[PDB]
Structure 1
Amino acid sequence: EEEAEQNLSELSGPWRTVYIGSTNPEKIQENGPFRTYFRELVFDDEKGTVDFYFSVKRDGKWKNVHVKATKQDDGTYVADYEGQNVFKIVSLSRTHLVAHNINVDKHGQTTELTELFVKLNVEDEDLEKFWKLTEDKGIDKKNVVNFLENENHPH
């Protein structure tokens, strides 16, 4: 029985959107800028940043977007995306993230959003079991597809 040492950087990896609520429904409706499907998050303790990778449909077309947020002394984060954003992590653990975001768009309109995100955790022992079974069946490693990275890098 063992578990990796808890580190903020250990939280980095594939994350998925569960729910997003908005004070302004138009922001999360079809073609809304905040109807975001998360792919990956990267936390950097040293730099005090969080890199967001997500997908959003715009003009009937899916787009991959990257946003870097920077931490402030008070602990909140600021990011530039469809206006200015100040977001706050309300709850965070190895498997979930609950956040509150305040957005002020290019017209001075303020929208507040809430979101619940979950992390996809792949444990070492499970990967080992998969590879052993795969080698037992005489399957060459080049004949294995990584579906998770495909989902993390869509088009």
Structure 2
Amino acid sequence: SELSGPWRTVYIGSTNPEKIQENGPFRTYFRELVFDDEKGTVDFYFSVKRDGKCKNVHVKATKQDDGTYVADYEGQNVFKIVSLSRTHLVAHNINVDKHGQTTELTELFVKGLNVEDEDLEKFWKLTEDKGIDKKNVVNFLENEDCPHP
């Protein structure tokens, strides 16, 4: 709940590179998370480029009894937060598309001044553990390349 505020994306890894390349659905630049402990929800606010245009998107995730979350976005998503504090969030997600095809993703998001070594280590271990190659991780300091007509 004190966890709500201006989160930013650091890295996202994918088993399918096409999903996180420019114009891909999972190239999500976070702006804000809102945690609601009484409802067991997390609201995500982020920008993503699709079909050559940038949109500000909102997705609501709901905590399950087993501790994992579900959310509908570009398919159906089931995810686990593996590490969470006032300054970092490390998570892995399974996305299921309309054809039953699955993509596994890993993510590091932060709300502190810096990215701590401890943050990075958890992210990179998880990414290796899920079989994600280093070339299939995106660095979100890259230009989103939004048009400005």
Normalising TM by the smaller chain, what interval?
Answer: 0.7 to 0.9
> Where is the helix percentage greater, Structure 1 or Structure 2?
1
In structure 1, the gaps of 5 or more residues are 1-8
Native 8 Å contact 2:49 2:146 kept in 1? no
Tell me the C-alpha RMSD between the 2 structures: 13.2
- Paired-residue identity, %: 98
Runs of 4+ in 1 over 2 A off after TM superposition: 120-155
Residues 128 and 65 of structure 1, relative CA distance in 2, 3 Å threshold: closer
Normalised TM-score (structure 1): 0.72
Higher relative contact order, structure no. (Cα contacts within 8 Å, ≥ 6 residues apart): 2
Give deviations 1:3-45, integer Å, cap 9, x for gaps.
Answer: xxxxxx1000100000000000010011100000000000000
Which segment drifts farther, 126-135 or 88-97?
126-135
Verify: 1:135 aligned to 2:122, yes or no.
no
In structure 2, the gaps of 5 or more residues are none
Native 8 Å contact 2:7 2:109 kept in 1? yes
Native 8 Å contact 2:46 2:56 kept in 1? yes
Normalised TM-score (structure 2): 0.75
Which segment drifts farther, 123-132 or 94-103?
123-132
Which segment drifts farther, 17-26 or 136-145?
136-145
Question: What is the distance in 1 between the residues matched to 2:132 and 2:104?
Answer: 50
Verify: 1:113 aligned to 2:105, yes or no.
yes
